[PDB]
Write a protein that binds this ligand. Structure first.
Ligand SMILES: *[C@H]1[C@@H](C)[C@H]2[C@@H]([C@H](O)[C@H]3[C@H]4[C@H]([C@H](OC(C)=O)[C@H](OC(C)=O)[C@@]32C)[C@]2(C)[C@H](C[C@@H]3O[C@@H]3[C@@H]2OC(C)=O)C(=O)[C@@H]4O)[C@]2(C)[C@@]1(O)OC(=O)[C@@]2(C)O
Ligand SMILES: Nc1nc2c(ncn2[C@@H]2O[C@H](COP(=O)(O)OP(=O)(O)OP(=O)(O)O)[C@@H](O)[C@H]2O)c(=O)[nH]1
Ligand SMILES: Nc1nc2c(ncn2[C@@H]2O[C@H](COP(=O)(O)OP(=O)(O)OP(=O)(O)O)[C@@H](O)[C@H]2O)c(=O)[nH]1
Ligand SMILES: [Ca+2]
Ligand SMILES: [Mg+2]
Ligand SMILES: [Mg+2]
Lengths: 431, 440, 67
């Protein structure tokens, strides 16, 4: 088929990575041993996109598990579905990067990267027709951020004509008080804007805000944040994993979502998001569902889409519902919110409906927006970056690994260019 | 002889191909295994249906067709489906990686890897013809393969077969079922590239078909299956002149003489009737006069446009079923006195009529009522340029910002190709304007 | 008249051949121009990545000469 190779780097990357495989394995009827115990043929139709077939009709995730911390290796393996992963696909260092991007990207991570590439190459060589790669990682730490972006460049060098997709978790003081995370994030974005085809901005700020305000959780664990991430990741890969017409592969998605090569940072969204009290979808209608997914409160990136314009949008509805009603409501939203969609890209909102709903929901909606309002995310990081870099705080962590402060300046400048470019097309008119 | 070879390109072309050939089989009494009990000449013949079907010594009637797609999953359904025995495996051709809704990949990057094989398989079909008339090419405007590969194929066919006739059935994009934002780019690019290599092209506006299925067949949300079964009836009407014989059955090539006044002006507007549900067809006879009148209702057109605000350069009526000239002549007389039918001053106003006595057929599980008589009007009207205008505007909106252009450039294309293609379309719109102006 | 008849069919042949010829050449030219362009775009991409590799060596070298 059209194989995707999954890579997960660092703590965050492996945590959300493992949850991703748990969720879609259940959807495809794969149990922790790798045996299929489902009923629907739709589950197996495009299974090879993410799973390798093995002896005894076993399905093995085409997944590569990376970290400089040796401990996470055990965390994954001990978790549910931890046994399903290929033993040889675990690649581990002897100590974490200590939130040092330079260590992950230039030194200790650079010492481990060839070992990862050997596993990538082995997986890739067994592909009928590899379409591309999928990386899960955080930008705030040192390994997922630093070594993850190193991996992308090295993979791109050997697979320059394949698609590179990332699920990038953006740092937020509301979740982590590590003070160097704005450095690591800026340095990472500097890499991502150049070397990835599409990036899903999973914002911890948004994940916290959703849990605290909407779902009314006083103290959100990483497990609760990751439930939102995994549900989102299931949604935005639905079109890749089940038979369908729209965005059925990584390249077609990119061609529909990315009008300019650098502007490939997406705002993901999900609906319903409701506390157990009140509604758990008790007559959440298609109209209500549709309005919710376009609201600021349902975005996985802490940005208000009504502070910008959509270049492109992909909407995926899941569950049994009227396609006529979905069509009507999507037209309605675009009609009533016309100003927020750029006029110089006609028909830039595409809609898919998948009969298979996610676990525990009768119907849901997943949102992928390329909005100029994402600049609010980068501006937030940029502000935090400056507060540190004006004092050259903790800068010796990075120069100590051999970096120059000029690279900090260039990364900052490149992210600033990204913002102004998103602003350029926000201000553009047809006439 | 006068064999016709069909080439089905990309998902749209292939899936429409499925519907057409299923219908043909039912019209000619050909079974899914290819056997045709009524055909007493085993292993060959020069009957009318042989224009579209070759014959094996074992009695199998095989479509003179090639199916081509750059990914395998659509054609794989043909290979394992109901009519899998109908086609030789070599007629069904697939790659492993599609054009990703990119004209550049269909014409260059991916297409070039399979083009020689496709031509070899087409040659295999051609060499089995004793008097090849030409090709019919089915494809979408919007897909990467439908746009890019088709235009590559058309160019190569002009080289290998000269001025041998090439007809198109082209699927024009509609937002209700479109799958790519860049479909306006792909449409303009393929139309420009193919224009000199096509003798006649029947555009099928997916929105027109969508609307017809919604309004006339009460289908809440039409699928490709709904669309394609209707489209197949219209294609069948057009090709019936080639697949059946009869005293009054005028050949398509003769309609073409009237339909193409200049080489670039080769886009007929198709209008079909009756499209009616079984529920409403019951105890309802649609007469010749009624179905003929319906041909001048723009809601029944294959392309959304308004001929009442344009000028005609030709009008052809292709009847099938229980129809005799007396009733046609009476029907046309009435229409001449009531409708908005203005011709350009440089062409005759007479309607060209063909009649095929074989009645319309329907596929089981379909939406269309089985009727005793049907008609397809083929008109050459300046109004069809509306379709160009709408696409070209969508093209202009995006191209002014060079939105998505990097995808094409990254595959080796140049901006000069875009502007060249767009300029040709501007000239084409201008052409349709000029032919409508009165003579000195 | 016979001479004219010969010249008409000859002209028909020549125009058809010229159409085939020009179609063949224009296509050959397009495929070559396209391959050159794509190769150049990929080459420029790999060169950018090679420069990153060069920079990384320089960063690691810089570390050694500070300890
Ligand atoms: C944290 C706790 C908040 C998690 C819990 C369950 O796995 C989560 C279920 C999820 C809950 O959503 C609610 C009720 O607001 C909630 O997840 C959240 C708030 O992020 C739960 C209890 C469910 C019930 C979901 C089914 C259905 O879709 C509704 C809802 O999800 C949403 C987004 O509304 C589930 O099936 C989940 O099981 C835990 C165990 C938690 O205690 O720690 C975790 O790791 C967790 C998220 O799995
Ligand atoms: N949403 C979410 N964020 C996480 C999770 N784990 C860590 N993070 C975030 O990731 C950032 C730190 O990156 P990590 O993944 O922990 O670090 P690392 O990639 O392992 O790199 P090093 O530990 O320095 O070697 C912080 O901002 C955390 O808030 C997780 O499980 N879910
Ligand atoms: N009427 C009709 N239109 C179709 C059908 N399938 C696809 N289309 C239309 O064709 C356009 C997309 O082109 P496709 O044929 O699917 O793409 P392709 O030719 O396979 O090219 P690639 O997939 O990019 O390689 C859209 O406008 C669709 O609405 C079909 O079965 N019937
Ligand atoms: Ca015979
Ligand atoms: Mg760590
Ligand atoms: Mg296709």
């Amino acid at each position: 088929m059209r194989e995707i190779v999954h890579i997960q780097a660092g703590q965050c990357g492996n945590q959300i990575g493992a949850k991703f495989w748990e969720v879609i394995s259940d959807e495809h009827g794969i149990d922790p041993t790798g045996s299929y115990h489902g009923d629907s043929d739709l589950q197996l139709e495009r299974i090879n996109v993410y799973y390798n077939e093995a002896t005894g009709n076993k399905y093995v995730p085409r997944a590569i598990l990376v970290d400089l911390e040796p401990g996470t290796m055990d965390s994954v393996r001990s978790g549910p579905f931890g046994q399903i992963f290929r033993p040889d696909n675990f690649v581990f260092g002897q100590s974490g990067a200590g939130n040092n991007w330079a260590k992950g990207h230039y030194t200790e991570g650079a010492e481990l990267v060839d070992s990862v590439l050997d596993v990538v190459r082995k997986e890739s060589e067994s592909c009928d027709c590899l379409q591309g790669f999928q990386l899960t990682h955080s930008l705030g730490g040192g390994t997922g951020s630093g070594m993850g972006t190193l991996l992308i460049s090295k993979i791109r060098e050997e697979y320059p004509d394949r698609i590179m997709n990332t699920f990038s978790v953006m740092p937020s003081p509301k979740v982590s008080d590590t003070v160097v995370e704005p450095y690591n994030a800026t340095l990472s974005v500097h890499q991502l804007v150049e070397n990835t085809d599409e990036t899903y901005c999973i914002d911890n700020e948004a994940l916290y805000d959703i849990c605290f305000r909407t779902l009314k959780l006083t103290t959100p664990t990483y497990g609760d944040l990751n439930h939102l991430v995994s549900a989102t990741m299931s949604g935005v890969t639905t079109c890749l994993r089940f038979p369908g017409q729209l965005n059925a592969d990584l390249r077609k998605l990119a061609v529909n979502m990315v009008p300019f090569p650098r502007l490939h940072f997406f705002m993901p969204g999900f609906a319903p998001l409701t506390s157990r009290g009140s509604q758990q979808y008790r007559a959440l209608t298609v109209p209500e569902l549709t309005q919710q997914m376009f609201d600021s409160k349902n975005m996985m990136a802490a940005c208000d889409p009504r502070h910008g314009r959509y270049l492109t949008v992909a909407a995926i509805f899941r569950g049994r519902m009227s396609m006529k009603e979905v069509d009507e409501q999507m037209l309605n939203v675009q009609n009533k919110n016309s100003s927020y969609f750029v006029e110089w890209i006609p028909n830039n909102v595409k809609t898919a409906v998948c009969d298979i709903p996610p676990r525990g929901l009768k119907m849901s909606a997943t949102f992928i927006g390329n909005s100029t309002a994402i600049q609010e995310l980068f501006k937030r990081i940029s502000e935090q970056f400056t507060a540190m870099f004006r004092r050259k705080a903790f800068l010796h962590w990075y120069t100590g690994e051999g970096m120059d402060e000029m690279e900090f300046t260039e990364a900052e400048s490149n992210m600033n260019d990204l913002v102004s470019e998103y602003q350029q097309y926000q201000d553009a008119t047809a006439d | 002889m006068r064999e016709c070879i069909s080439i089905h390109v990309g998902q749209a072309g292939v899936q429409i191909g499925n519907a057409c050939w299923e219908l043909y089989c039912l019209e000619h009494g050909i079974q899914p295994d290819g056997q045709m009990p009524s055909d007493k000449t085993i292993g060959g013949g020069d009957d009318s249906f042989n224009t579209f079907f070759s014959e094996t010594g074992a009695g199998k009637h095989v479509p003179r067709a090639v199916f081509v797609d750059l990914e395998p999953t659509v054609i794989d359904e043909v290979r394992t489906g109901t009519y899998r025995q109908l086609f030789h495996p070599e007629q069904l051709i697939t790659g492993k990686e599609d054009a990703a809704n990119n004209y550049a990949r269909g014409h260059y990057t991916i297409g070039k890897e399979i083009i020689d094989l496709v031509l070899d398989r087409i040659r295999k079909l051609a060499d089995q013809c004793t008097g090849l008339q030409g090709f019919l090419v089915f494809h979408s405007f919007g897909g990467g393969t439908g746009s890019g590969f088709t235009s590559l194929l058309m160019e190569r066919l002009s080289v290998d077969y000269g001025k041998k006739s090439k007809l198109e059935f082209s699927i024009y994009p509609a937002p209700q079922v479109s799958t790519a934002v860049v479909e306006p780019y792909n449409s303009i690019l393929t139309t420009h590239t193919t224009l000199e290599h096509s003798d006649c092209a029947f555009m099928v506006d997916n929105e027109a078909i969508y609307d017809i299925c919604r309004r006339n067949l009460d289908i809440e949300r039409p699928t490709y299956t709904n669309l394609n079964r209707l489209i197949s009836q219209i294609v069948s009407s057009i090709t019936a002149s080639l697949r059946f014989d009869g005293a009054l059955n005028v050949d398509l090539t003769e309609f073409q003489t009237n339909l193409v006044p200049y080489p670039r002006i080769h886009f007929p507007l198709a209008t079909y009737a009756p499209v009616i549900s079984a529920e409403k067809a019951y105890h309802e006879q649609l007469s010749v006069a009624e179905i003929t009148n319906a041909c001048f209702e723009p809601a029944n057109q294959m392309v959304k446009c308004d001929p009442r605000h344009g000028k005609y350069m030709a009008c052809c009526l292709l009847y099938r079923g229980d129809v005799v000239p007396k009733d046609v002549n009476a029907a046309i007389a009435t229409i001449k006195t009531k409708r908005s039918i203005q011709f350009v001053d440089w062409c005759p106003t007479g309607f060209k009529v063909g009649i095929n006595y074989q009645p319309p057929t329907v596929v089981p599980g379909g939406d269309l009522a089985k009727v005793q008589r049907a008609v397809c009007m083929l008109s050459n009207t300046t109004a069809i340029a509306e379709a160009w205008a709408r696409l070209d505007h969508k093209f202009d909106l995006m191209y002014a910002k060079r939105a998505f252009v990097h995808w094409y450039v990254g595959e080796g294309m140049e901006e000069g190709e875009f502007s060249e293609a767009r300029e040709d379309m501007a000239a084409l719109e201008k052409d349709y304007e000029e032919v409508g102006v009165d003579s000195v | 008249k016979r001479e004219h008849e010969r010249e008409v069919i000859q002209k028909a042949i020549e125009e058809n051949n010229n159409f085939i010829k020009m179609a063949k050449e224009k296509l050959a030219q397009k495929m070559e121009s396209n391959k050159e362009n794509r190769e150049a775009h990929l080459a420029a991409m790999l060169e950018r990545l090679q420069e990153k590799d060069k920079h990384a060596e320089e960063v690691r070298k810089n570390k050694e000469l500070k300890e």
